[PDB]
Nucleic acid binder design. Sequence first.
RNA 1: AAUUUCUACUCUUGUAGAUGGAAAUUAGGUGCGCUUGGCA
DNA 2: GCCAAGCGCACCTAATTTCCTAAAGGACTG
DNA 3: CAGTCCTTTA
Length: 1272
Amino acid sequence: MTQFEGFTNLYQVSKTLRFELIPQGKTLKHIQEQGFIEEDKARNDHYKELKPIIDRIYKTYADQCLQLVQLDWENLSAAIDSYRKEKTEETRNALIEEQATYRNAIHDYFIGRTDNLTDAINKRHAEIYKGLFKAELFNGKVLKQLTTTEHENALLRSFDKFTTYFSGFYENRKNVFSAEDISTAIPHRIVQDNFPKFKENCHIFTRLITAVPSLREHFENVKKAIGIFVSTSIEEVFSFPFYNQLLTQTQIDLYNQLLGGISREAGTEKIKGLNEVLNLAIQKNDETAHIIASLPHRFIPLFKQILSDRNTLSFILEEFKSDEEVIQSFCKYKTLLRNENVLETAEALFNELNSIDLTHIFISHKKLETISSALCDHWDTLRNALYERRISELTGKITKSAKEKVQRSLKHEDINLQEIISAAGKELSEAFKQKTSEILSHAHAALDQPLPTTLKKQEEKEILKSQLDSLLGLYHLLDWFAVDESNEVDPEFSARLTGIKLEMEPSLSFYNKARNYATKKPYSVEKFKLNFQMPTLASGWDVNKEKNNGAILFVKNGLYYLGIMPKQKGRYKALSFEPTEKTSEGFDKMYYDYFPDAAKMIPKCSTQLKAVTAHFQTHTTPILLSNNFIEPLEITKEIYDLNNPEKEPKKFQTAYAKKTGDQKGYREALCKWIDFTRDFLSKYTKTTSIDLSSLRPSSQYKDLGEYYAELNPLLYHISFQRIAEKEIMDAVETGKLYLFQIYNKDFAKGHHGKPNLHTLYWTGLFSPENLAKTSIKLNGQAELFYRPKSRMEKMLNKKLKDQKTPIPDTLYQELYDYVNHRLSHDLSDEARALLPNVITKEVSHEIIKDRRFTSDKFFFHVPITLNYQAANSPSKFNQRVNAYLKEHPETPIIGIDRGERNLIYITVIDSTGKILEQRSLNTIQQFDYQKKLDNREKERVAARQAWSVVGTIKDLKQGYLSQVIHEIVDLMIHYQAVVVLENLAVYQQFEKMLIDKLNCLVLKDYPAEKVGGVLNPYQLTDQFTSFAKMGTQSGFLFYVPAPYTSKIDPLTGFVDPFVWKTIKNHESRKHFLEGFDFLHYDVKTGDFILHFKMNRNLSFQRGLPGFMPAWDIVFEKNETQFDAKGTPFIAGKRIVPYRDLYPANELIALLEEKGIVFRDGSNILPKLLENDDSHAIDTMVALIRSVLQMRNSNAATGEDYINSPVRDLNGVCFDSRFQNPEWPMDADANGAYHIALKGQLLLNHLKESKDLKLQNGISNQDWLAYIQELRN
RNA sequence: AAUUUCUACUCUUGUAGAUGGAAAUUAGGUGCGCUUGGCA
DNA sequence: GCCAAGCGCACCTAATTTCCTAAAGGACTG
DNA sequence: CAGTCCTTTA
Ligand code: NA
């Protein structure tokens, strides 16, 4: 029998804590004298300079290995097809194995174990890959297999006797060449990223060529016109064998540029690619265009190779290199425009247009729509005015063919200025005159305005952009005129225009060159890693490593301290601190005794020793180890062969038992290995004294992971011993010990409130109850940072005299300027009405914005592990949760939904579907986070347009979501409920933050001993790995599809069954109305009733029969109803593209226009069909579509309600405008309600099942039939 | 309007909630400029 | 003005991998 | 030569 408090201590969770370090005594002084911080940055900067140089070895070697790859991808394609064909778990595992096989085939080119290459070439790669992740990179040996310059050689020697600084970097480069299913790797990018894209490209290609064969020669011309793949036809680049030549970045770039085309410098025609050719063919809007548009018509570009440098054949602008370079160069080009008098020449040309012949001044067709939008009401007016005047001068019977010829002519021909004026009216000339002088005056007012001295201030950046906008505005104006000699251009005008047009041409690149520099991020100060010339600083906390790592911890009178022991005179000298009797003044110094993962440390210290492996290469006799063993440990060939099988799975692993299938052999090898580890642990110096009597006999462990999950907690112990006070002050004065105080806001002197959750982890780690039984472990590989300084009366409360209501942001800064007596104008009306109810604080001490960044500070990052008694990973976590849910049928459900007018909307229901609580999370704690987020995004968009600093919105999102995470888990724990989400910005981040919080949930008000306390965290969600590897369920979290959660009637489950893309023409609309049985007027109730059988109109439905065989759709009588607050609204009102529609009144109007008698309950449909009015039937169909549109919304009105078109078995038509709290209050509440109900389906189907496995996915038909069977 | 850091704060030289760091890679987005076209 | 398919640039955002180590191994020093 | 200490490991 399970309980809710049983979901604790199920798997380990690792977190990192951050603190500030406060130097003590002479600590800060000795560091400045030894130059540690100075050389820590220099070594940091040498790393950043050397990293790209070292990457040349990886990039070159990886690129060289990928050039010889030749594989047959036919098997991989068949596994992809079979998984898309049948969605069974057998085809998934077949594809996963097939991908792993191909990843290893690529990996064998790196390590040199592929049968495709000869032994001489195959062995040469192994000699490189061996020393590819250690100090052999710096020998130049690997580069000798593939010449260093003096500065590079000087950079290599900067890490002499210090190559451990690249320790984590070595792991990042193993992630590049790894064969595992990790996205950081090259084999994964080839097999699972680019090939499915390339395989899809081949299918898109052949489908287009078969339907439109003319597209074949057209694609071939694009390939020949660019010059890519000259030795390969267009059909072969869309065949599988060519993908072997698409494994390097240069080939991937050429492949992507065949799809995307090539751009020259700005302002010139671009080389089109395959996707642009298809896009233009569709925009012709002919019969062929509709066929191409029906098929897939966009090839997918391949992803880049890992670590590779992207190449492009397009033009890259020259980058301005300094601040004054843009001022000196622009002012030089700016002062050149005065001497040439290009403004006076331009002002004279546009003044010529008042008297010269305008029938020879031509406007470009590529600019006609832009000019129409800049001088007239819309882009349409000019093209339409020319259309009407040209139709006005056609000859004879103006057919519709002659009109289409006039339309097509206006798309691709230059119009003379006279025909535009004669067709648009005199008001265009006034618009042309006003716009021309407006642009000319701004350019004239900008050439004489001097540039600033520097670009330091934003006000100086603005005037540079303002003058460039005026220059680009004149450059834009000149491009209005046609340049092609196909038109009869004026002799003098075309020569003078082309002259000043080419003299304004460099201004376009100056705009882009200036923006590419002025919008660059300013230099900011960043924290950097400290080492104190110790390559393994704070690597581990063990007592055997205190001299090597030079880091220990103290706790004195509730305060925590970090001690650093630097090298004295370039030599290590472990200043042995002497434990002393208690009560003597000093610090409780921690003694950290730890033996790491036994799965690797025991083989490392015994069975994998070089002497053991070498001995068993020749001899079969046992070998006895004596070094670091209190008694000799025996290694037999039977034991050595178990951990060195030469078969991929070791015989004591579950993989061997699951692959082979012999339980007699598996349980024998498992028992013989556990007995060997017990023999090791009893004799090894680090573990011989550890009492392991709690471990059960070896033959009782079912698998090895279960044994290691019980052994590792016994290999870690922490204890404290008092140290002499006088001994540390000596070690601090001499400089042999640097002492800091591990500090945060909860250790300030004035601190008196609740602690931060991270500090409860910290104090709980060192609580005496945790030292006896370890729940939280202190982990190694900590880091120290040093970030320099970054930045450089009366105060006002944000809330009123009552603490609940806040001052609006528009009135806060105005009141703060007033109480400080620095407001330079009259105080506004409402701000003066809020004056008496305002709370003012007197500045008793300076409170400085961003105080941490104004001074230099040290920082300390240390990782910990919670739930240390549990295993590293859980086993059957979802099945453990589902076992609880079957024993707790009344577990409520919390449905979280992403709304259209709400960031997050939640709805809590009980086990039977009744709503218990519904709320929008746009605002929480009386703060509108939606408006703040939306106003922040507007500011960031305007910042990019104004070349200002953009800023950060991710810090505002996390702060909002944290308040959301707090509110959701409270509802989760109070209700012991299940959270349901949508299956796929603000919502994606909320999902991860919710899983992480429930992976290791600690409530700061619970006592440490209780479930939920710091020593017994809650674990409600499955262990997070990645989003791709996650399924439908993660513990108490569930994911359901979003379709049919909003536009669904919460009283019946009804949805709109028809797809309106198929009801397109008159004959289809007539057959659609013939599928309905009757439509008549109810005299008593006053509304219309439309009866529809679900088995009719099958060609117009979405294929979802649901559960009801028929439905009574009603045209609700447009009465005036009132909600629970007395606010009026019209029943049946619909909002369509917006306008308000009243269908029942619009229907009565239609029937009276046709004289159709309906007040006798007569069936109306046969009368409309027999009369066969084209306009009346199309209106009748539109009315039905409006009635079936439940979700009616208009942003300006604030409306977003659900109004059901069907009446339930209880005679009610649901309308969220009644504001009944028992039911959804709007459309977003209706989504969250039905999301929780989709999760209820999963829990309802779990109890009827005999297994503990949830059903994967919810089909729309199973959901509609389920929810309709319930409500009817 | 102070913070390991973030958000919201101020009866309190601080309060409430949250907080996996670092390294590495990749993908996407926003804005601007430009090219060819579409806007029934 | 909007939109489509692209290209160049500026910066912002997030997903996914690794480690969270004492001790063996061995190159260098005195 | 063996101690020291950075490098590399399971
Ligand atoms: Na607090």
